[PDB]
Amino acid sequence: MLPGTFFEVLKNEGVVAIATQGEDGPHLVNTWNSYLKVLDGNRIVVPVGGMHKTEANVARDERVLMTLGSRKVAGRNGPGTGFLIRGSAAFRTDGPEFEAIARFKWARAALVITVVSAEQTK
Amino acid sequence: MLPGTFFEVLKNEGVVAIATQGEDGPHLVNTWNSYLKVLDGNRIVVPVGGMHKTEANVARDERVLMTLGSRKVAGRNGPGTGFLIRGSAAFRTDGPEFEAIARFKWARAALVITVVSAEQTK
Numbered sequence A, B: 001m002l003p004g005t006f007f008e009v010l011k012n013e014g015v016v017a018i019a020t021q022g023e024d025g026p027h028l029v030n031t032w033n034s035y036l037k038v039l040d041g042n043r044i045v046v047p048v049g050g051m052h053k054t055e056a057n058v059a060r061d062e063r064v065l066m067t068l069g070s071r072k073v074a075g076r077n078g079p080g081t082g083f084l085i086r087g088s089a090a091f092r093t094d095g096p097e098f099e100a101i102a103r104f105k106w107a108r109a110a111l112v113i114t115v116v117s118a119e120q121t122k
């Protein structure tokens, strides 16, 4: 369901934000546009170095939100666009999904987000 | 408390993420690095066009999280850095805080975040 415009955004660098539900409010961490690996089946894979609090939150509630964008991709009303992604998260430490980001020597896991919806918010 | 590195990040364009506590999970919206207006007293102002769900969430829980960064500013161990900002939010439709972003004519309000902590996460 990820649209072409989303893939255009990925051709440009930027800060990706991933929100999870914490015990006393939301938690928010980041990665880079260039680090995302998209696999068939609506899967976005993120290389995990830290994200220990994020992983703990996902264990209690798999639902996460992700935003990303680029000023270099045209939006509906002018330069720049971005997306709000909603999906379920899981942490993999072996298999094809981990190998997808194993190139990062510091990776301890792969954060796999299965997309349920993708909205272009600009 | 906002460090020099944070201001260096603001010299570069990028996508800012703002997380709030929603009724059934977190909510996440965006703005641009270039749109942030920093005021004395640890205040970060954001021009508000939409953010209706965000405003509703802030009405129930004023605590918000904000992340931003830039690959153009050096981190501790390599290129690129960013920040996790924690603070309290308030929406203004008049007064000096609103006037700070009034140049954006599409702004129905100003999202004022009073920062409690700023952590460079890379």
Ligand SMILES: Cc1cc2nc3c(=O)[nH]c(=O)nc-3n(C[C@H](O)[C@H](O)[C@H](O)COP(=O)(O)O)c2cc1C
Pocket: A015, A028, A029, A030, A031, A032, A035, A046, A047, A048, A049, A050, A051, A052, A053, A054, A055, B068, B069, B070, B080, B081, B082, B083, B121, B122
């Ligand atoms: C621009 C930027 C990119 C980041 N990329 C990653 C990344 O790819 N993987 C990762 O584990 N942490 C990354 N981080 C650090 C996380 O945002 C987070 O601070 C750290 O993983 C701790 O996660 P936790 O608070 O869930 O324990 C990045 C931080 C910034 C500012």
Ligand SMILES: Cc1cc2nc3c(=O)[nH]c(=O)nc-3n(C[C@H](O)[C@H](O)[C@H](O)COP(=O)(O)O)c2cc1C
Pocket: A068, A069, A070, A080, A081, A082, A083, A121, A122, B015, B028, B029, B030, B031, B032, B035, B046, B047, B048, B049, B050, B051, B052, B053, B054, B055
């Ligand atoms: C790159 C990018 C920048 C944005 N900048 C703003 C902004 O400055 N002000 C604003 O009100 N919405 C901005 N938005 C839209 C918000 O993220 C959000 O979708 C919208 O305000 C609705 O908020 P709500 O979901 O809290 O109702 C931006 C979206 C993107 C992708």
